[PDB]
């Protein structure tokens, strides 16, 4: 997976993500953009698969956008897992959807995604509606290992997250980080937009054989939420 | 690159029944067979039977509304509650 949260020269936040998963031959046919309605209004929007209740990509209009990437954890037993469910722990995709349903604003959603205990490790990428509102939350089962924020005034106008910790080098066999940085580097902060970010997420190998769908979004312009099925 | 279908899901409707308009999009019969086969081959039968009992007995104590929603998906697709629960937890199972 590849998630990107970035800021243009005006202070607008952009959020994009690629979902790579095997069995994609089947999933691509099952990808839907779901608008969850509550009290006669669109509470939030998410991209999921038919039969799957959690969200790995979602949007709270004019509040925040969230996407989740996979992180490798310690070996977990199915018995320990059910215990974690009853102990009170949450699946990583169910916390994303809960946050989209409950959290009032960007900072409150980052707090929920960082502190809530989880069954497995994950990366939470969150984007907001105001300058500098972008973070990569590296999660353990217990809590936050790190919180990597946007730093545009120091030249860090984008954060890239794949499936490895951002402070360690990626495997030479699966290096989709540097090509995503090269493409964002080449695009430039001033030329950043949803469509320019979609182009970045169409670069190979950021988009590869197992990529299922691409999403670009911005909580401040919730009508521009768009998903594309890849390799279909 | 085409866009996925865009469908509404009402959180004002019962959890077990709010996903049905979405389930009728893809071929449900093909989805049941695809889920039942892939879960059947990777998970032995005795584990699935136990998973079913736990989820059904402790439905009140597992997270909501997700569990009651998985109950309604599996009932519409004629899947075992264990089958619907394992696919929804496929990430953690890895
Ligand atoms: C991206 O651009 C910066 C220049 O601001 C440079 O220091 C960095 O090495 C570049 N990274 C890649 C992967 O090209
Ligand atoms: C979804 O709801 C909106 C208003 O909430 C409505 O305009 C639209 O037609 C609905 N779409 C579907 C596919 O039900
Ligand atoms: C599921 O079984 C019900 C009867 O309980 C039947 O009406 C329905 O057509 C079946 N659907 C599938 C996808 O098997
Ligand atoms: Cl704590
Ligand atoms: Cl851990
Ligand atoms: Cl990475
Ligand atoms: Cl690593
Ligand atoms: Cl735009
Ligand atoms: Cl509810």
């Amino acid at each position: 997976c590849t998630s990107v949260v970035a800021q243009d020269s005006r202070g607008h936040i952009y959020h994009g993500r690629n979902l790579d998963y095997p069995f994609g031959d089947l999933l691509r046919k099952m990808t839907v953009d779901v608008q969850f309605l509550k009290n006669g209004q669109i509470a939030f929007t998410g991209t999921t698969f038919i039969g799957y209740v959690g969200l790995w990509t979602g949007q709270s209009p004019y509040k925040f956008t969230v996407s989740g990437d996979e992180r490798a954890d310690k070996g977990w037993w199915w018995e320990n897992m059910i215990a974690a469910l009853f102990q009170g722990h949450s699946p990583v995709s169910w916390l994303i959807r809960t946050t989209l349903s409950e959290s009032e604003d960007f900072e409150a959603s980052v707090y929920k995604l960082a502190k809530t205990p989880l069954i497995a490790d994950v990366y939470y990428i969150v984007g907001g509606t105001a300058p500098g509102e972008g973070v990569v939350v590296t999660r353990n089962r217990g809590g936050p290992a790190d919180i990597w924020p946007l730093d545009p005034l120091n030249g860090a106008w984008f954060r890239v997250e794949t499936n490895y910790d951002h402070w360690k080098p990626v495997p030479k066999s699966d290096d989709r980080r540097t090509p995503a940085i090269k493409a964002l580097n080449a695009t430039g902060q001033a030329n950043l937009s949803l469509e320019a970010l979609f182009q970045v997420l169409s670069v190979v190998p950021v988009c590869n054989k197992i990529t299922v769908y691409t999403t670009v979004m911005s909580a401040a312009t919730p009508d521009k939420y768009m998903t594309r099925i890849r390799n279909l | 690159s085409p866009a996925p279908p865009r469908v509404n899901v009402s959180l004002d409707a019962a959890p077990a029944a709010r996903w049905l308009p979405v389930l009728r999009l893809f071929d449900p019969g093909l989805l049941r067979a695809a889920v039942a086969r892939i879960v059947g081959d990777r998970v032995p039968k005795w584990v699935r039977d136990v998973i079913g009992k736990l989820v059904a007995e402790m439905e009140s104590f597992l997270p909501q509304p997700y569990t009651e929603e998985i109950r309604g998906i599996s009932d519409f697709l004629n899947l075992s509650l264990a089958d619907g629960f394992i696919v929804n937890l496929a990430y953690e199972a890895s």
Side-chain angles (χ1 to χ4, degrees):
Chain A
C1 286
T2 306
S3 289
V4 181
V5 61
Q7 201 190 274
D8 67 353
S9 283
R10 297 182 306 174
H12 195 73
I13 300 292
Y14 300 97
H15 194 167
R17 71 96 80 259
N18 272 347
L19 198 294
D20 309 344
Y21 202 72
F23 292 108
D25 316 88
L26 192 60
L27 292 179
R28 294 175 173 93
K29 301 287 206 169
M30 299 168 36
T31 298
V32 291
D33 279 340
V34 188
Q35 290 190 340
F36 296 77
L37 305 181
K38 212 190 308 181
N39 299 327
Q41 77 214 22
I42 295 176
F44 52 97
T45 302
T47 309
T48 183
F49 311 110
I50 295 172
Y52 198 76
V53 302
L55 297 177
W56 289 88
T57 307
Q59 180 192 249
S60 186
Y62 298 87
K63 287 180 180 167
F64 60 97
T65 54
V66 53
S67 74
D69 290 18
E70 177 254 353
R71 195 186 173 208
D73 48 324
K74 190 226 180 200
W76 214 234
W77 310 75
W78 84 257
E79 295 87 320
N80 277 287
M81 192 165 295
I82 304 300
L85 292 172
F86 290 113
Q87 179 171 8
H89 297 198
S90 180
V92 303
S93 58
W94 297 9
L95 182 58
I96 287 173
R97 183 177 152 191
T98 308
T99 300
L100 292 161
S101 172
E102 287 177 14
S103 289
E104 286 182 0
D105 70 79
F106 165 85
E107 174 170 351
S109 73
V110 177
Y111 173 83
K112 202 185 191 97
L113 293 168
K115 292 298 277 178
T116 304
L118 296 167
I119 301 166
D121 299 7
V122 72
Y123 300 99
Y124 286 137
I125 301 85
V126 194
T129 57
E133 287 188 346
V135 289
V136 174
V137 187
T138 301
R139 279 300 316 269
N140 294 321
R141 302 181 178 93
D146 189 38
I147 295 179
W148 201 22
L150 279 173
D151 190 13
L153 296 176
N154 197 79
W157 57 275
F158 65 81
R159 298 301 187 190
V160 176
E161 176 56 54
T162 306
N163 306 100
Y164 315 91
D165 298 338
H166 70 71
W167 62 93
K168 302 164 172 169
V170 296
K172 309 281 171 50
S173 63
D174 179 25
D175 183 348
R176 296 168 286 114
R177 180 202 289 177
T178 50
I181 297 177
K182 263 187 66 54
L184 286 163
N185 256 7
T187 300
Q189 187 180 356
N191 312 321
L192 183 67
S193 61
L194 289 182
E195 199 67 24
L197 187 53
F198 189 95
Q199 271 182 173
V200 170
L201 296 174
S202 299
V203 179
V204 177
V206 181
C207 177
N208 53 58
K209 309 185 298 182
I210 54 166
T211 290
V212 179
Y213 69 80
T214 297
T215 301
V216 294
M217 46 183 176
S218 188
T221 55
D223 292 10
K224 295 198 213 163
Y225 189 99
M226 69 182 264
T227 301
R228 267 35 181 172
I229 311 296
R230 322 304 300 264
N231 302 296
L232 192 65
Chain B
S1 292
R6 193 176 291 272
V7 57
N8 288 337
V9 166
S10 175
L11 294 169
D12 294 329
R18 65 170 61 118
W19 282 106
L20 301 198
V22 181
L23 291 167
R24 303 190 181 95
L25 266 45
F26 195 58
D27 189 4
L30 184 59
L31 183 61
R32 180 214 65 80
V35 168
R37 185 188 73 80
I38 303 175
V39 182
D41 287 320
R42 285 152 178 271
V43 182
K45 183 159 182 167
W46 69 270
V47 178
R48 297 190 292 101
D49 293 326
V50 178
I51 296 291
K53 302 173 200 147
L54 289 171
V55 174
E57 282 164 359
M58 324 294 174
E59 204 276 356
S60 306
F61 312 100
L62 289 171
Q64 290 292 313
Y66 308 109
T67 307
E68 184 67 2
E69 282 178 5
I70 294 174
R71 205 262 290 175
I73 294 166
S74 300
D75 282 10
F76 173 90
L77 300 180
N78 303 319
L79 274 172
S80 56
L81 184 51
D83 269 336
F85 217 78
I86 295 164
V87 293
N88 273 271
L89 292 162
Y91 173 81
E92 292 75 17
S94 295

